[PDB]
Design a protein around this ligand. Sequence first.
Ligand SMILES: CC(=O)N[C@@H]1[C@@H](O[C@@H]2O[C@H](CO)[C@H](O)[C@H](O)[C@H]2O)[C@H](O)[C@@H](CO)O[C@H]1O
Length: 597
Amino acid sequence: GTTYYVSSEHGSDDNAGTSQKSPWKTLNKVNEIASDLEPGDSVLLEYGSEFNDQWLHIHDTAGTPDAPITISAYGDEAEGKPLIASNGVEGSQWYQDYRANVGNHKTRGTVSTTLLLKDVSYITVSNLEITNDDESVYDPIDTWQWTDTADADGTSLDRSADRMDRTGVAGIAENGSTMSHVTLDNLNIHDVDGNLYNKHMANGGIYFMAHLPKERTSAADDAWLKEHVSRFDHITIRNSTVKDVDRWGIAVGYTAYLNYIDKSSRWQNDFDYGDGTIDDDLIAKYGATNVLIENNTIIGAGGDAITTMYCDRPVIQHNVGDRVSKHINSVDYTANVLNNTGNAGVGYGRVAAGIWPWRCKDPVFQYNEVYSNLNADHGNGDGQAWDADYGDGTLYQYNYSYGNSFASLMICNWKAVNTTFRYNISQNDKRGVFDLPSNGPGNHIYNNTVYVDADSRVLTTRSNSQAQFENNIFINATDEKKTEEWNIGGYYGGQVYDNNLYVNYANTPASDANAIVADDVADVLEDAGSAPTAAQASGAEYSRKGSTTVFDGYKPTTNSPAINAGKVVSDLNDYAVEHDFFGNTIKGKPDLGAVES
Ligand SMILES: CC(=O)N[C@@H]1[C@@H](O[C@@H]2O[C@H](CO)[C@H](O)[C@H](O)[C@H]2O)[C@H](O)[C@@H](CO)O[C@H]1O
């Protein structure tokens, strides 16, 4: 098919636009043909371009498996990725409507979006700079700090509950068809100044949600509704940066069809989650398939870094979350949050975790780093790196958490079931490592290494529910031997421990008939607590290849009591043991903790 060139500085809207020799100047020539773009068509924006007060709204078109549509850059890479900068302009706005009740949230309203993909399939978008700046909002994460009062050091926030929602990239399905094979690659998304509060409008860095294609009046409409399902398949977001956005970093899969998955009777925000189990057929039919989120960097999101929602077996890997929950605090999150009818309340949704799933089935979170999730001591009711939330079969493996305000992992309330947390390193995670607030059963927590400083402890004090703890290394990183509270509460049997390593503690858990005790961590691990304290300058995950890595301190010493000392785990959630934190195969009786020497 056809290739179109646009050059902010060298082009003219009087050119044919079909040649680098004679390119267009503005995105309005692209907006005009957007829905007529065809398989194989490309739109190439020239490195060094700035499209200020402009936007790209592509709708109701598709590539083919063999001829996809491409939005990318052309020219001298060194001039910097072409910038698209809508700046909130009225021309960037559109009307969002789920067309049903999809939670006690604002789910209906005006949205400013720099790059909107509405029912577009088989499209790749790459190599773009995307902002949605409000010059009247300034709160950069690079120089952010906790201030007792609002708007100190010439920061400025709009705390309005009714602040217009903004997104850098919005993926919207509302045709009752599958929106499939969307690739976002190597986008630099920043300064998307959305609503501080709203969780389920297209409000943040990147947001994909599905709407009903028409209102549902009564049960009589289900037969039709269930056969024209707006949903996502094969969404990939990779190599992208999302920085200084409100509220969400990356959110994929919130859907009107949650009324089928969450079994609403009246469709009046009334739900039945059953035992927390989610049927395969249900999440596959009404939710999102083949969602892949990899090699991204999230810095200073107002709320959560990355959240998969109503996704079937999504894969979230090699991503980095850095200093999120910036705006989830008592000074910034002040207003009485909107619903569609009135108020959801003051402090409603004043909670955020790092990288996690909402009502997903067997999501895989592997090879991710999360640093210093913010504000647990200033009004953030979460502040964890990881949150096995409402959902079934969450797998967290091979992840690094550092310095999070409140704990490494949460497992959140009654309908959070069948979680595996294995081969993860937690270092300097504050006020707890494991957060077990009223969680459901089936949770297996094994072959983790957890470095517990004097500002933390093994369990959050509010922990009260089920966890099977095996082959862990617990390190009391203080100057005396601590008597730890190994056990709080009894929901679904409470915390059961077997065959873990307890370093520099004065006691072991009552339930652990197979405890390994060591007084000195230096007889166990090469250099515990020595992994990094902040994300690599580049935003990439630190390397885990070579003779030398930043994680080498978690390697067991040559005659470590960790070596071959684990029980052989039977994973309670049908997740086969394969390798350790570094990709080293597990050989024989596993080594205690997250690293096979
Ligand atoms: C079980 C629970 O309450 N978990 C909290 C999450 O709250 C829900 O999130 C979904 C969005 O995917 C809806 O907004 C739902 O109505 C909320 O109750 C919360 O999202 C996270 C962090 O933001 O932490 C838990 O406390």
